[PDB]
Amino acid sequence: PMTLGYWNIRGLAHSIRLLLEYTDSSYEEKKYTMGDAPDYDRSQWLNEKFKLGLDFPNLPYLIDGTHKITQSNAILRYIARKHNLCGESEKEQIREDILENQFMDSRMQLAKLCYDPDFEKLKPEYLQALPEMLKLYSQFLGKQPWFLGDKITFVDFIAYDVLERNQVFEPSCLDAFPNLKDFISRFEGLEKISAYMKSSRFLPRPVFTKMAVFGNK
């Protein structure tokens, strides 16, 4: 078995869990929690942070025998690699890295709103810019069933997440982009995935359980 670990919330560990299901990987989730006090105490992780014995302690993490991986991307590539879910040619590879990185910056932009207290006043900013960075993805993807081509790679697990996050934030965001919304319906079509969305284990409390009224409240 393997061991993944993150906060009781969504966070980065999401796609990571999704990629772990598509590969039938037998993993376990050491879930850490933030103290429900007005001020959320994050010292639960801290207590173990250094005892796990990780090269660069941080959450999320994945331990596997003689392999304790850290850094969201570093964890995904590891799994994907063991299941041929990575690009094979320079071509599919340049697309792969561009996306891999891009989606991250994009993951940040949305996350910023939540990290910043003055969300409500700054929320519009992200909303107005959305379409531009959206059409870019829908154009790059184009007529492809999966972002890279006719084969599914780890990069889709990243994609889907960054696209669902914007979908729950604002549902109309994808209506003008048929292929993008269609992309999501295809992802949420994989047996191994659909089945997972019908599992006994999913959020006990709402999304963003801790931090940001964008879920916390």
- Binding positions for substrate: 115
Tell me: does residue 71 bind ligand GDN (CB under 6 A): yes
Closest approach of a second copy to the CB of residue 54, in Å: 10
For the bound state, the minimum distance from the C-beta of residue 217 to a second copy, rounded and expressed in Å, comes to: 28
The interface with ligand GDN within residues 40-59 (CB under 6 A) comprises: 58-59
* Residues in contact with 51: Cβ distance below 8 Å, sequence separation at least 6, in sequence order: none
12 binds, options a second copy, ligand GDN, none, Cβ within 5 to 8 A by partner type: ligand GDN
Q: How many beta carbons lie within 10 A of that of residue 34, not counting itself? A: 19
Q: How far is the CB of 19 from ligand GDN (least distance, A)?
A: 14
**Would you tell me which residues interact with ligand GDN (CB under 6 A)?**
7, 11-12, 58-60, 71-73, 101, 105
Interaction site with a second copy (CB under 8 A): 55-56, 67, 69-74, 77-78, 81, 90, 93-94, 97-98, 100-102, 105, 136, 139-140
